Amino acid sequence: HQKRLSAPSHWLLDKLSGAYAPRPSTGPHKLRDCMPLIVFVRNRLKYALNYRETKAIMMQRLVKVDGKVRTDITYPAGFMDVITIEKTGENFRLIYDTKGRFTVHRITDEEAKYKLGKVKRVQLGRGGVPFLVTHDARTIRYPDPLIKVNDTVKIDLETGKITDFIKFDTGALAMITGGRNMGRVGVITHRERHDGGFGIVHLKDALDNTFATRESNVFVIGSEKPWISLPK
C-alpha cells in the first residue's frame, strides 16, 4: 500500500500507474533489491496490461525465473536473474545502467543457461559439511575449496552446480550494486582493508575516473571476460 513516490527509483514507473505500487513478496532478494515480476512484465516490459492479466499469465505455467516456474506475482527478481518466456522464446537478465537504474538484456539459452552469482559466505555445516551461500541466497554443498568471500561463481542453473569462479582481484573489471556511485562499470585497481569495519576498494572506470567503493557493495564481473553480454 506504499506510494508510487515511495517506490525506489532504480525500477521505473510513470505518473499514470495509480498512486500505489505493489510490495514485493519475501524471498531470496532483498526488498529494495527487488523488481517484482509484475513490474517486469507489464510495467517495464509491458507484455501484459492488467493486474488480473499478469495474474492469469502467471497462473498458467508460461514463465520460468532462473529455470524454475514462479507463480507468486510479487516474487523478488533483484539482480541478473534469468527470465525465460518460451512463447516468444526469449530470456532476460537484470543489470544496471551507468545511471543506476534497472536494465534488461534480451538473450538466448546459450548465455542464459548459467549465472554469475556473487559469493556471500562459506561455512562448515552439520556433519561438518562445507556449504556456500551466494548473493541469490543459494547454498551449494561441497564447493571447490578455493572460493572464499568476494568471489563470484558461474553456476549451472540446471543442476545448479559450480561451473566457474572469478577471484576477488584488484585488476578485474567489476560492477557497482550499491551506494552513491551505484552502477558504474570499472576495474578494481586497489583495495584498502580498514580492519575494524567497512573496508573499501579503489576502482577506476575504463575512462580514468577513480572512486572509493565499499567491498560490501562491490560486484566483480570478470577481469576482462564479459561473461554476460552487456548491451552496446
Binding site: 554443498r141 561441497y142 575449496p145
Partner: protein, 46 residues
C-alpha cells in the same frame, strides 16, 4: 485401503531417499578427488 498407487507412492518416497543418498555419495567422492588435486597443486607450488 492399501491401493497399488499408495504402494507406488511408498516406492517413490524411498526411491527419492536412495537417490538423494547416492547423490550425496557422488558429490562427496568428487569433492574428495577435487580437494586432493587442489592440495597436490598447492604443495607442488610449495
Amino acid at each position: 485401503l492399501v491401493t497399488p498407487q499408495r504402494l507406488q507412492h511408498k516406492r517413490h518416497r524411498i526411491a527419492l531417499k536412495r537417490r538423494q543418498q547416492e547423490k550425496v555419495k557422488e558429490e562427496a567422492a568428487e569433492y574428495a578427488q577435487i580437494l586432493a588435486k587442489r592440495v597436490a597443486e598447492a604443495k607442488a607450488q610449495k
